[model samples]
Target: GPMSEAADVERVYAAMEEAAGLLGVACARDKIYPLLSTFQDTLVSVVVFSMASGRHSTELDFSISVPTSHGDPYATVVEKGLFPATGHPVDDLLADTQKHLPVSMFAIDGEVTGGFKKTYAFFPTDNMPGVAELSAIPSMPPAVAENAELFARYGLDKVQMTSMDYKKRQVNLYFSELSAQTLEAESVLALVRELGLHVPNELGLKFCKRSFSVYPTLNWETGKIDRLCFAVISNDPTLVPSSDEGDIEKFHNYATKAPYAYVGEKRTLVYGLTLSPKEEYYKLGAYYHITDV
Candidate 1:
């Protein structure tokens, strides 16, 4: 047997190694002679997968960083060439890669730009060389791709129950108590953290179910509050007591009407925080609970 004439070769770093560890794919150091030295320094090593075009797309690529020391710890290089197609097949390659490395090996992914036909080279279960048939990839209901994308974007632990309609498009199924998003809520907490960072812009929330966020400006003249809107939903009844008491009253009047107020669970707080130019960031405020949902 000879060495793999891999069509292309690229370098990855240490963080990648850590992810492998999380996935139970951990390994020791002292591996790789060459590689994202940058990656070894920053960010998580998201093992890659490349889905080229056609049923011929076999080959599940994974990679790892070199080390914290000896490794360049700051660069990524791509070496391209021709890999005259391995005849051994997929499983053989995985085992071979293991056998080839004394420390551990990588499952890499790469960027192959342009053209028409597309394949998914990312997800673990997708294209792997010599698997025989080309998988439909992910092969699931719509929500599957959407939820995972959130994890990729926000770097959260996980997402729970989600839904979607044909072509209706993306919707965040859950934003945690701080509005961080239940989909990727801090898993270690084991439950949602209603406070902390729920509202998107740090709005205000007395509740989440059907709550209102109050963005406000101070008249300074009369301390009058006006304007608003992640005002998270909750049941804590604390009030900021702003000049906009009438504003909440207005909502109460309108919502109490028929079409708007059915279950009496609608409410809006006055100013999320004072408009006074904060010596720090923004206003240190609270949601003056209006109606109780």
Candidate 2:
């Protein structure tokens, strides 16, 4: 018994609503609720089939298509190019006059001007701006000052810089290749104190390893340094906080014993630290091949 069918459907609907809010998207309750109800029916049917056939589950796939019209919001924006299309008479006029327009014009102007008169006469409407550009802008916090005390106490390089925002309660660190060599358990502890991050003794580090190989080509020696490692670190208690506790512990043990195991579960968040030798620098004009699933 996973849960009651009705309760499960309600949970799924709540999760969907939360996800939509997080992404700043609005979903119509009437439409979204019915979609969730239909999804619940399909899940119930699948469970019934699995139980009758003594199988855990069956695979399913589906596709959907949405109709669009010229008047639709998305279609209208696509056709108009956000500001009016270029090369139109009004666009030509605006192009000629835009340079002469005062900076104050930006405050009240919202629509694209086809001509100087059209642009000058423009008055902004509440709905015209659409979404606020401020909401989408990305910015980083001020860089953390290098902690001389931590570097001296831990015998770690002072290059591992951290940035912290007390108001947001968030901390970020940047580790260059040179900084990675000095990272250790004790050094990580020093960083924790330096950054004022409240957590247990166990921390994790995310690191990447790169290697270079030179091979004979048709007429020349081609050299390439490939970046191979990228990993997330989780401390002992952090592993399997919900499930898979045994598997995580086994992985931790095996990774700790390996000579070049760059990826493993650690007990702290000492992220972006490297453990292996530095390879040749990545060069421009070099072709690269990558395979991934």
Candidate 3:
């Protein structure tokens, strides 16, 4: 029942291709398919299609994990066009980053708004360094250095992951604690307030309650906060108690109706809200996990 072979990748892609047609958008087959095809021991899970603002946009997202199989783990991405054959030596850069923050999985986003971006997940490493040590990594974005002390001040030095928009040169930092109790709405509100952003009334603070993770989008070079995001595990209906509360309920309804093929059985679900400093409302996202049978 393990979805490890090449055919398994095709099955997942075919289902997503159909889902893309259903939503009237082009799947990134040309870009993503080859990349998925080249790797071994890969698992695809946590697929999402965001219903942002008031539009049912075709923003497709998914998480895939490839174990260290054979030789260089990034060799497949380079050959498949996710990275250029020439330009700053991406493989070398990743090698440096991997030394400190050994990645376990990658979260990929495919949206019409921008090019596909990949977020490297570093959960398997129990030796993740503190903000001071993380800032010392030469491959890390300049934003990490500028906000290192601020992150330490609020006890947010414990980071979960980093997303790099290689095309846009923007980076986001996901900060979280091991405990669910410490990530409540109030603490996140205080953290964002310190950074000069607030949760709009349309997306109330109630929605931010019980978040298991929080992230701040910062520019790669400028080191400025672009947006803040909060994600809550949706394993329990009582936590989200769906209603016409806001766009949260809207995304819930949309994802529930979205089509899926027999890629695998459904797994954990996640609900996320994106708040921006320049926007009056928050964007809603729903993530559904489907893995091996």
Best model number under lDDT: 3
Q: Which of candidates 2 and 3 is the stronger one according to lDDT?
A: 3
Local distance difference test values of all predictions, in order = 0.24, 0.24, 0.55
How does model 2 fare in lDDT?
0.24
Clash pairs (backbone) in predicted model 3: none
Error of 1 at 278 (Å): 25
Task: State each candidate's clash count.
Answer: 38, 13, 0
Model 2 TM-score, all chains together: 0.22
Q: How much lDDT does candidate 1 score?
A: 0.24
Ranking by TM-score: 3, 2, 1
Candidate 3 stretches greater than 4 Å from native:
1-6, 40-56, 70-75, 85-93, 106-116, 178-186, 236-249, 258-267, 280-293
lDDT computed for candidate 3: 0.55
**lDDT, candidate 2, at 234:** 33
- Model 3 weakest 10-residue run by lDDT: 85-94
Candidate 2 lDDT over 27-142, as tens digits, reads 45554444334334333311100000001011111111111111122123225343334322223222222232211121001101111011221112221211121112122111
Local error of candidate 3 at residue 57 (angstroms) = 2.3
Better candidate number, 1 or 2, judged by lDDT: 2
- Residue 278 lDDT, candidate 3, scale 0-100: 54
